[PDB]
Amino acid sequence: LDFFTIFSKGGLVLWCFQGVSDSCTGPVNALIRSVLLQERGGNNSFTHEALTLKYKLDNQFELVFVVGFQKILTLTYVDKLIDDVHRLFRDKYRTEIQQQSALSLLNGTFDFQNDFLRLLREAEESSKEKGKKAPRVWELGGCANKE
Amino acid sequence: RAVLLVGLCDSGKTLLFVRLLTGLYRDTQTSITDSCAVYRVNNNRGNSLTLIDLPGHESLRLQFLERFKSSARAIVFVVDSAAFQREVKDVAEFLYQVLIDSMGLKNTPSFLIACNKQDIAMAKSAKLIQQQLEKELNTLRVTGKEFEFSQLPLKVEFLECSAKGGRGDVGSADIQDLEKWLAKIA
Ligand SMILES: Nc1nc2c(ncn2[C@@H]2O[C@H](COP(=O)(O)OP(=O)(O)OP(=O)(O)O)[C@@H](O)[C@H]2O)c(=O)[nH]1
Numbered sequence: 606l607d608f609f610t611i612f613s614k615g616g617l618v619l620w621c622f623q624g625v626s627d628s629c630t631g632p633v634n635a636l637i638r639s640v641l642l643q644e645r646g647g648n649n650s651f652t653h654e655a656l657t658l659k660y661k662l663d664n665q666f667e668l669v670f671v672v673g674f675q676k677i678l679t680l681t682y683v684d685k686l687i688d689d690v691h692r693l694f695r696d697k698y699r700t701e702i703q704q705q706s707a708l709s710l711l712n713g714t715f716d717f718q719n720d721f722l723r724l725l726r727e728a729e730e731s732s733k734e735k736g737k738k739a740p741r742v743w744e745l746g747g748c749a750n751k752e
Numbered sequence: 753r754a755v756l757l758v759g760l761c762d763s764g765k766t767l768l769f770v771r772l773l774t775g776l777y778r779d780t781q782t783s784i785t786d787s788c789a790v791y792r793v794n795n796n797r798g799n800s801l802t803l804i805d806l807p808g809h810e811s812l813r814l815q816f817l818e819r820f821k822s823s824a825r826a827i828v829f830v831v832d833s834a835a836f837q838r839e840v841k842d843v844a845e846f847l848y849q850v851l852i853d854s855m856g857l858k859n860t861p862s863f864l865i866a867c868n869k870q871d872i873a874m875a876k877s878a879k880l881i882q883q884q885l886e887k888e889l890n891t892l893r894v895t896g897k898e899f900e901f902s903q904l905p906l907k908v909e910f911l912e913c914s915a916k917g918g919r920g921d922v923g924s925a926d927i928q929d930l931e932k933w934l935a936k937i938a
């Protein structure tokens with residue numbers, strides 16, 4: 606993985622580890638435009654210009670998970686990793702996300718870096734005229750019996 | 753009661769929403785839904801208001817404005833000063849309908865014009881931005897006098913602000929007039 610973000614429907618980024626590898630100038634804005642207007646529905650389609658991007662929605666807590674890899678071919682473990690990280694987020698950070706108000710989300714701090722790194726290590730280790738013939742005889746059969 | 757934040761895309765609405773509450777810088781993305789939060793003023797009275805931020809995308813601006821203008825007590829329109837000269841028309845067109853939909857209310861709320869991104873030297877002055885807004889809106893009304901906010905029967909103010917402030921967010925936050933205006937209208 607070379608890019609990964611977890612931001613809410615309110616336009617606030619909760620956690621990311623992009624680093625010097627990638628800069629989130631406008632990689633997710635185009636995806637947002639495609640979701641809002643195009644309504645892609647193409648199973649994680651729409652690579653923007655240089656790297657493939659995939660997304661996952663969470664209507665229960667109004668959240669979206671975005672993962673960006675290079676345009677080079679990548680294995681299918683990315684979707685499994687996304688599902689696992691989403692389930693871990695829902696299991697652990699349920700207290701903040703269940704609250705509708707954004708004040709609790711602002712106040713809370715999430716130290717998800719180590720757990721996500723462990724999940725990434727596990728994923729990388731896994732990656733490494735009907736003619737009717739007949740005869741000249743007749744049939745023979747008997748009958749049943751009853752009371 | 754309620755204060756509604758409006759503006760175009762990448763206008764800093766989320767940053768203004770978060771800085772006035774937490775004061776710590778947070779990475780932000782495009783707003784596609786609404787966000788409402790309760791904020792208590794720093795004065796002795798400690799009045800509690802609700803700040804509501806709506807998406808800046810054109811595809812969802814009206815659908816939420818026409819629904820959230822029923823309980824709005826004040827409105828803050830954020831205008832990007834750094835990139836104003838290349839998008840004069842769009843912000844003026846948005847404000848043209850904003851003014852009509854606000855005047856359609858029973859009670860006229862207060863209006864703030866926050867010229868954001870004032871840290872950059874490219875940012876224009878608030879007075880010049882107001883003059884340009886009047887000049888553009890006079891032509892917008894045509895397409896007997898030039899438009900004047902004094903003639904407009906609203907409590908409109910023009911101020912300068914910046915959320916990130918470029919190099920100004922390392923030690924503090926350059927937001928001083930907004931809180932004073934909120935206290936004055938509180
Ligand atoms: N230096 C500086 N940059 C700002 C300021 N306000 C907004 N920005 C720019 O805005 C970018 C982030 O987008 P936001 O400010 O959150 O705009 P937004 O909330 O997405 O606005 P919407 O698209 O309507 O949701 C940053 O990369 C900044 O470059 C400011 O006051 N100072």
Ligand SMILES: [Mg+2]
Pocket residue numbers: 615616764765766767780781782783
């Ligand atoms: Mg926003």
